[PDB]
Amino acid sequence: PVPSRARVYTDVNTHRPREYWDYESHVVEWGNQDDYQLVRKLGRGKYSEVFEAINITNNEKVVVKILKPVKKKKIKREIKILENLRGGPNIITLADIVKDPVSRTPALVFEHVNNTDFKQLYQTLTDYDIRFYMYEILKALDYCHSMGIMHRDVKPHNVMIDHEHRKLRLIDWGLAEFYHPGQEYNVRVASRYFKGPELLVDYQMYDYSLDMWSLGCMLASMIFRKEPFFHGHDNYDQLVRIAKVLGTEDLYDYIDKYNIELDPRFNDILGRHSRKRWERFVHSENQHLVSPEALDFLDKLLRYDHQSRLTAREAMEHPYFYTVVKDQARM
Ligand SMILES: [Cl-]
């Protein structure tokens, strides 16, 4: 299988001192859990439970993510990633790290964030707001990509939004990792529906461009008002749903170019499928959310070859965002 290197931000970690990305060596400076009191539970998941809390020394509202038991190196990874990304635009801001008195697990203290995520609104935004928030998500991905980090779990549930203040934050960096050219990565990342083809075919030498595919899936879901857009019933079917849209021609080309192996009995199931036109998924209901710019943008995101997808910066420069960058910040 042919090796691959990111087209952008290729060597950003290489040009930084090892301390930046060598998270196993990172020495955690713990804060004091006694300075925070938990107010109410906001949610619970595989790896954490999330609480509203208060910094008692100054009454600041914060959000606390208490990690469930996990290998230390993954905890160190998320912490170091979060610390390197502090004050990046639209990325959740880590304010402190404490140990849970009870479980003894690390708990991450974040700037306050609204408890509404980008799945609760985003089947109802205007055309203008979809462009607006899409651009805000792009700032966070360009930023984290520029800092040598792949998020690897982009999806609506991982973007919190405060629509009334038009603020958004990309959250849940528990699956993120540092990009190093030549490194092979776990392909068991992302929710099925936002998994890029490279993950579906077990191609391990992937990069930031994985996030750009997931972003395209969110965009498709929003403008076509279908959630999810690629609704696979298992990992194989996810690729089949994709191939039914992008066609099999470009898929087989992609597999060849990286010398990817495809279980030949899966190939029999995929067969051949025509590349469909995006216009195919337009209906009276979603008409107003679609435009030529939107479809061109979507087309340049949802590409099999990861090397061919728009970079975050290229996407920020796409005509889809031409006007929305002139936003006059009305609340
Ligand atoms: Cl992993």
Swiss-Prot record:
Residues 36-321 form the Protein kinase domain. The keyword Transcription regulation applies. Constitutively active protein kinase whose activity is not directly affected by phosphorylation. Seems to be regulated by level of expression and localization. GO terms for molecular function: ATP binding; Hsp90 protein binding; identical protein binding; kinase activity; protein serine kinase activity; protein serine/threonine kinase activity. Coiled coil: none annotated. It catalyses: L-seryl-[protein] + ATP = O-phospho-L-seryl-[protein] + ADP + H(+); L-threonyl-[protein] + ATP = O-phospho-L-threonyl-[protein] + ADP + H(+). Keywords: Apoptosis, ATP-binding, Biological rhythms, Cell cycle, Disease variant, Intellectual disability, Kinase, Nucleotide-binding, Nucleus, Phosphoprotein, Serine/threonine-protein kinase, Transcription, Transcription regulation, Transferase, Wnt signaling pathway. The active site is at residue 153. It is found in: Nucleus. The keyword Phosphoprotein applies. One of its GO terms (biological process) is chaperone-mediated protein folding. Belongs to the protein kinase superfamily. Ser/Thr protein kinase family. CK2 subfamily. Can use both ATP and GTP as phosphoryl donors. Phosphorylation by casein kinase 2 has been estimated to represent up to one quarter of the eukaryotic phosphoproteome. Casein kinase 2 has been found to be increased at protein level and up-regulated at the level of enzyme activity in the majority of cancers. However, elevated levels of casein kinase 2 are present in certain normal organs such as brain and testes. It is linked to Okur-Chung neurodevelopmental syndrome: An autosomal dominant neurodevelopmental disorder characterized by developmental delay, intellectual disability, behavioral problems, hypotonia, speech problems, microcephaly, pachygyria and variable dysmorphic features. This is Casein kinase II subunit alpha. It comes from Homo sapiens. The chain holds residues 4 to 334 of 391 of the full protein.
